[PDB]
């Protein structure tokens, strides 16, 4: 469900699809997907951070516990008194 998190697709690790020539990960001799996710056939991107071993969500995800809360604050803590309301109307039936 890591694609359901954030609408644009997760940042996929660099597959065989991109692998540009004149670049440092330009291995020759059976090039398939899995070595680019295994972190230690992966020599680093050499100017960019180390390649991921996974697919991570995109550019517009906020990081960490961002507690929004539900209390109205002290305007709701002083500007209202919740006098006892009841819904008896008893369905004893």
């Amino acid at each position: 469900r890591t694609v359901s998190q954030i609408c644009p697709p997760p940042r996929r690790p660099l597959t065989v699809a991109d692998i540009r020539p004149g670049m440092e990960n330009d291995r020759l001799g059976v090039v398939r997907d899995s070595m680019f996710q295994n972190p230690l056939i992966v020599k680093a991107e050499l100017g960019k951070p180390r390649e991921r071993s996974s697919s991570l969500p995109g550019i517009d995800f906020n990081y960490g516990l961002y507690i929004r809360g539900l209390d109205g604050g002290v305007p709701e803590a002083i500007g209202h008194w919740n006098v006892f309301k009841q819904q008896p109307t008893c369905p004893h039936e």
Partner: protein, 436 residues
């Protein structure tokens, strides 16, 4: 209304300038051509940008560099259109790792031009707030020209706030053998006139990028970008609206106890590389602890072998101030962070309501970052290391002939050495506890 003048001296200063203006372009709506695609209601662009007839918004800066090809990188690359073509003060002849050339013969054909430019840049300023001098303690330009420029600006606008952002010499690697000969002179000359100077050590930036960013071979584009985030976090109160808005006069009344001790150190909170920020929580307590951890400091100095004298926290983003206050209480009662005995209140609090904006690259897009700026006694070890290196290099009079045959008088190295002896004596004097 609240603006600062940013002068970028030498190769290090102008590369940090390229990185920082790269940051402010996408920090505001100013696309890297000059205009703004906003269909506007702003008044936050005016701090580091002008306003021309339609939309061009030239920035308040000056790139001065006695050698070309780097100002030509600026005027050949992507960002030429945004800058004033006459703001680019290129010289004609490199200072060649020589304070004598940076200060004594080839400054005099460019000093009048750069002073004139700084003057009529300050003319477009209702309230000018400070000077941002970006340089190193290394090469000839970034030592001698920033020394002489510092003297002339302190003569002309001496009452104003004066900030230096300088790359401190490395303790182990360095890039010049005349790093001590140039650092000794530029700090001896700028001690009396600099209001405060924040230091950066390349070794510590290498280690923090190797460890936290987890990057094995990145270049100076990634060295200077953390400094760009540092300066954008420092000069954010004058840009946005927050909770504890801090002024540059507060910074200078604040970060120094004494007139000459004016070297605090920067530190930037979460510097996680966005391939890792999913796995931890980046809360206020742990970012405040990560500021004081002896691995994220922007320079190599051991905090445990020293005492923090006064430090300032710039929380930026969605930060509730009482979590900051609780983290402050926990940090205060932690016993490994020792302070001077004469300063119970040593912490500063600032909250701004604008989250960090990240360029596509290394840093994680985080809505929270605190910049920690500590004036501390831990830099005395680095000063002693540099002074011992200067002693062992000067004791045989090596590399002195290039200095003295240029116009510099030979004996200034001596009184520079006793000036740093006085600085070491003062850093020792601030360390003893109260007996009287």
């Amino acid at each position: 209304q609240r603006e600062c003048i940013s002068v970028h001296v030498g190769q290090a200063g102008v590369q940090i300038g390229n990185a920082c203006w790269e940051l402010y372009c996408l920090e505001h709506g100013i696309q890297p051509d000059g205009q703004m695609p906003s269909d506007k209601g702003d008044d936050s662009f005016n701090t580091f940008f002008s306003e021309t007839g339609a939309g061009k918004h030239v920035p308040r800066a000056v790139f001065v560099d006695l050698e070309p090809t780097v100002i030509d990188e600026v005027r050949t690359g992507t960002y030429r259109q945004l800058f004033h073509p006459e703001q680019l003060i290129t010289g004609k002849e490199d200072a060649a790792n020589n304070y004598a050339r940076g200060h004594y013969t080839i400054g005099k054909e460019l000093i009048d031009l750069v002073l004139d430019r700084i003057r009529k840049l300050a003319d477009q300023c209702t309230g000018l707030q400070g000077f941002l001098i970006f340089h190193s303690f290394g090469g000839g330009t970034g030592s001698g020209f920033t020394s002489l420029l510092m003297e002339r600006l302190s003569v002309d606008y001496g009452k104003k706030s004066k900030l230096e952002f300088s790359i401190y010499p490395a303790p182990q690697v360095s890039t010049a053998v005349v790093e001590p000969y140039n650092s000794i002179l530029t700090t001896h000359t700028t001690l009396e006139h600099s209001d405060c100077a924040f230091m950066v050590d390349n070794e510590a930036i290498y280690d923090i990028c190797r460890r936290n960013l987890d990057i094995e071979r990145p270049t100076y584009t990634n060295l200077n970008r953390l400094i760009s985030q540092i300066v954008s976090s420092i000069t954010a109160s004058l840009r946005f609206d927050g909770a504890l808005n801090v002024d540059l006069t507060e910074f200078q009344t604040n970060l120094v106890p004494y007139p000459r001790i004016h070297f605090p150190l920067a530190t930037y909170a979460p510097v996680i590389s966005a391939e890792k920020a999913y796995h931890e929580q980046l809360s206020v307590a742990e970012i405040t602890n990560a500021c004081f951890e002896p691995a994220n400091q922007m320079v190599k100095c051991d905090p445990r072998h020293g005492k923090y004298m006064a430090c300032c926290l710039l929380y930026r983003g969605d930060v509730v101030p009482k979590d900051v206050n609780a983290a402050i209480a926990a940090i205060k009662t932690k016993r490994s962070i020792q302070f001077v005995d004469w300063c119970p209140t040593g912490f500063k609090v600032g909250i701004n309501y604008q989250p960090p904006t990240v360029v596509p690259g290394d840093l994680a897009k985080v809505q929270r970052a605190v910049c920690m700026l500590s004036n501390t006694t831990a830099i005395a070890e680095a000063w002693a290391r540099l002074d011992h290196k200067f002693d062992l290099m000067y004791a045989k009079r090596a590399f002195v002939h290039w200095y003295v045959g240029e116009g510099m008088e030979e004996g200034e190295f001596s009184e520079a050495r006793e000036d740093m002896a006085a600085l070491e004596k003062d850093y020792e004097e601030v360390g003893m506890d109260s007996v009287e």
